[PDB]
């Protein structure tokens, strides 16, 4: 999507696999503010916003808090308390034409600088002079949008660059986005320390013939102590017998 109409995608209620950011080494520029990517796949967030658009390389430095310029001011802006990451990589092989690719547009004039996370797509004729522009172009009446010049021979500073801005928002609500959780193989009939969905304990896990209801996740005895559980990955009921102990 063009920078002025920068495309917003939302991510929530899903396990966020960040391996795509790690394995992919083709990212020309990558900068994180507020959160460190290394400690990112084991931390939960309420929501993630992926705001993607296209610019030229010289402007890539402008997408960040405390930046100024055409891209920073009139098309896309970020808050001064931004907490996320910014990624940018070249797309010359895709966003260039022999006759010049002009499908990417950006706002060249605007009466005010955009507010944080503000999307403006109006094509109002910009009034650059005293004479009001009543929807007509001419003297001091210019179209607010201009098209990039993308050709195979264009210089690196003007070659197209796709930018993606991830912003992680953690409100006072339960976090639907968490990183992948690592599990291990299951061993039965042996005194093991088990941990099912945060329910921890020690005992011997044995196959059982108890029929849970579809929505029930754990069993209990009169003591309220865990007596049976259901393996989250495979829907089979496991009885839990406390490990043998006694007197010698």
């Amino acid at each position: 999507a063009s920078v002025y109409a920068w495309n917003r995608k939302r991510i929530s209620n899903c396990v966020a696999d960040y391996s795509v950011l790690y394995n992919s080494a083709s990212f020309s520029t990558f900068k994180c503010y507020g959160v460190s990517p290394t400690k990112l796949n084991d931390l939960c967030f309420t929501n993630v916003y992926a705001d993607s658009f296209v610019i030229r390389g010289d402007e890539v430095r402008q997408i960040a808090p405390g930046q100024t310029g055409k891209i920073a001011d009139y098309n896309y802006k970020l808050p001064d308390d931004f907490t996320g990451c910014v990624i940018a990589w070249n797309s010359n092989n895709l966003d260039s034409k022999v006759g010049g690719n002009y499908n990417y547009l950006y706002r060249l004039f605007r009466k005010s600088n955009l507010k944080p996370f503000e999307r403006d797509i109006s094509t109002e004729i910009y009034q650059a002079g005293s004479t009001p522009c009543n929807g007509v172009e001419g003297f001091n009446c210019y179209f607010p949008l201009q098209s990039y010049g993308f050709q195979p021979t264009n210089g690196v500073g003007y070659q197209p660059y796709r930018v993606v801005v991830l912003s992680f928002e953690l409100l006072h609500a339960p976090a639907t986005v968490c990183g992948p959780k690592k599990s291990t193989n299951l061993v039965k009939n042996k005194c093991v320390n088990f941990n099912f969905n945060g329910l921890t304990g020690t005992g011997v896990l044995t196959e059982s013939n108890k029929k849970f209801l579809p929505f029930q996740q754990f069993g209990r005895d009169i003591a309220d102590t865990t007596d049976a559980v259901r393996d989250p990955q495979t829907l089979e009921i496991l009885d839990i017998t406390p490990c043998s102990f006694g007197g010698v």
Partner: antibody
Amino acid sequence: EVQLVESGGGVVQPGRSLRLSCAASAFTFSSYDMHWVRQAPGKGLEWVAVISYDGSNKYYADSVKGRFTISRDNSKNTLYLQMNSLRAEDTAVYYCAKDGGKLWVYYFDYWGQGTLVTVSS
Amino acid sequence: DIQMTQSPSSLSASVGDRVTITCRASQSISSYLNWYQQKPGKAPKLLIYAASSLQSGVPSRFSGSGSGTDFTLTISSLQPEDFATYYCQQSYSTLALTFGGGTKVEIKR
């Protein structure tokens, strides 16, 4: 009580390669991201590289991106920094530092005594 | 990028004086400022993190304060073992960590 010992520093000509090794002790080396920080003679400190706890993520400052490499052996509790194609600017004292991980961002908790590296022709 | 200006470049003070050092940032950083201490020749050591947290094992006389762009490190009562160089380093821009110029504190005479 946390100990970090650096080794492998020395004098090397421009365009050569060097390998620095840091040995950590008295803490879980495998559960803390490790940072390489260089200080030039007479100048201030300067962050160089970072590696996550699991040895799957590596990040570097632009001054060294595509030029240095950072790895870790959790079994040996060691941190390796391969500095290939060294320039005169690389002349500095290198330290390995633990993260601490008490915040969402990177801070340095403990530092070693470091090792000197000089690049001259 | 983020430039950290640490002032004064160097100050003269006697033992027991309430020393203060300022650190300013080019842009706004929430609470991501840390203060390290370094003696001549010796390796730097951590004093303050998050700009409002005393590191374990550090004398209580050191205190960090400030938010936004301006931060201050204050020693209520200077001690002979406090004559060193202090660096202020930001962490907001995670992969662009930068350290301050430094403020050497000399013995006043």
